[PDB]
Amino acid sequence: NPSTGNTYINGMYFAPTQTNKEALDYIQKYRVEATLQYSGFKDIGTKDKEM
Amino acid sequence: NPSTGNTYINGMYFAPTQTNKEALDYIQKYRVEATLQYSGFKDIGTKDKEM
């Protein structure tokens, strides 16, 4: 954000290395709870991963 | 920064309020010391303001 840049999040990854290429596959859904900007710490969805 | 949101600093304004137009125009130089990128907490100069 150009004004008072605080790098508001757009998304995420989870790095693949040689080993976890089997372990990152069993996780199908992702529940996230975050702290937004104008309100506090809300519970935000469980939608599927994006890959 | 493009590869990782880290927001390296470039400069530093000081906001002029109605009640402090005398104090800021009184200060000529500014001595700075911060955490650098690859070096440590070095000291860097005392150069004049730039207005």
Side-chain angles (χ1 to χ4, degrees):
Chain A
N1 234 47
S3 325
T4 317
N6 266 322
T7 78
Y8 309 136
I9 288 183
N10 234 14
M12 270 278 289
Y13 297 83
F14 284 108
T17 45
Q18 300 128 75
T19 166
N20 54 12
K21 196 64 174 63
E22 170 180 19
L24 298 155
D25 304 8
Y26 177 62
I27 297 122
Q28 210 74 253
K29 294 155 51 186
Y30 275 113
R31 218 272 289 275
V32 187
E33 38 190 27
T35 38
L36 300 172
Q37 188 175 30
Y38 264 142
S39 56
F41 176 65
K42 212 164 99 181
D43 192 52
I44 314 169
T46 320
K47 264 175 195 167
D48 269 303
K49 67 216 185 178
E50 245 198 330
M51 275 265 309
Chain B
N1 227 20
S3 267
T4 307
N6 232 1
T7 64
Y8 303 145
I9 219 164
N10 260 340
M12 262 280 298
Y13 291 99
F14 284 111
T17 53
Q18 318 165 2
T19 166
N20 64 346
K21 231 75 171 57
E22 182 180 68
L24 290 144
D25 285 315
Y26 174 66
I27 297 175
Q28 258 195 132
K29 298 143 54 182
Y30 275 97
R31 209 268 299 276
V32 193
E33 34 176 280
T35 37
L36 266 164
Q37 204 173 347
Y38 294 117
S39 297
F41 201 92
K42 271 231 302 178
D43 168 81
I44 41 155
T46 320
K47 275 184 192 172
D48 297 329
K49 53 179 185 181
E50 258 213 336
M51 272 262 286

